[PDB]
Amino acid sequence: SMCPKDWKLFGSHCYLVPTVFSSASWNKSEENCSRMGAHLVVIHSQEEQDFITGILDIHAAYFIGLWDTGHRQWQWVDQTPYEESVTFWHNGEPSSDNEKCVTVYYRRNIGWGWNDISCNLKQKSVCQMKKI
C-alpha cells in the first residue's frame, strides 16, 4: 500500500536494493533509481543508516547518494544539507581525493560504514523514495 511491490517501508520512505541491475557505476545506479521515481539513498540519521544496512548483504558494497562535487565537498543527490556531525565513515575514510563517490560496506568485527571509491567502479546500490 504505502510502498510499491518489493520495496521496504521505513519512516516516510520506501527502500529497494535493485536486482535486474546486477552491478553499475554511481551515475548509472542513480539513473536506475531515478527511473523508478527514486534516488540513491540519502542518510540523515543513525536510524536510516541502520535500517538501510539491515536490508543489505554483508558480502557486498553499495553506492549511496553521496559524492564529492569539488575538493572533499560532499553533496546528497536530493540537495539536502551534508551534516559532518551525522556521518558513518569507516575509520580512515574518506581516504582519497581521487575517490569522489561513496559506498556503504561491512568491515568484519566493526560493522557497516562509508567508503569513498572511484565513481566508475561498478557496485550494488540502494534506492529511496517518499512513501505513497
105's contact among Ca ion, its own copies, none, with CB below 5 to 8 A by partner kind, is none
- From candidates 8, 34, 87, 93, binder to its own copies by CB under 8 A: 34
The rounded distance, in Å, linking the Cα atoms of 22 and 51 is: 22
46 binds its own copies (CB under 8 A): no
9 binds its own copies (CB under 8 A): no
Which lies closer to its own copies via its Cβ, residue 58 or residue 86?
Answer: 86
120 binds its own copies (CB under 8 A): yes
CA-based nearest residue to 96, from 128, 113, 112, 119: 119
Count CB-CB contacts under 10 A for residue 61. Answer: 17
Residue 31 among known ligand-binding residues: no
Count CB-CB contacts under 10 A for residue 130. Answer: 9
69 binds its own copies (CB under 8 A): yes
Q: Going by DSSP bridges, is the β-strand pair 74-76/39-40 parallel, antiparallel, or unpaired?
A: unpaired
- Residue 60 half-sphere exposure, CB side, CA atoms within 13 Å? 17
Residue 116 among known ligand-binding residues: yes
Point out which span in 14-22, 54-62, 77-85, 107-115 binds its own copies (CB under 8 A): 77-85
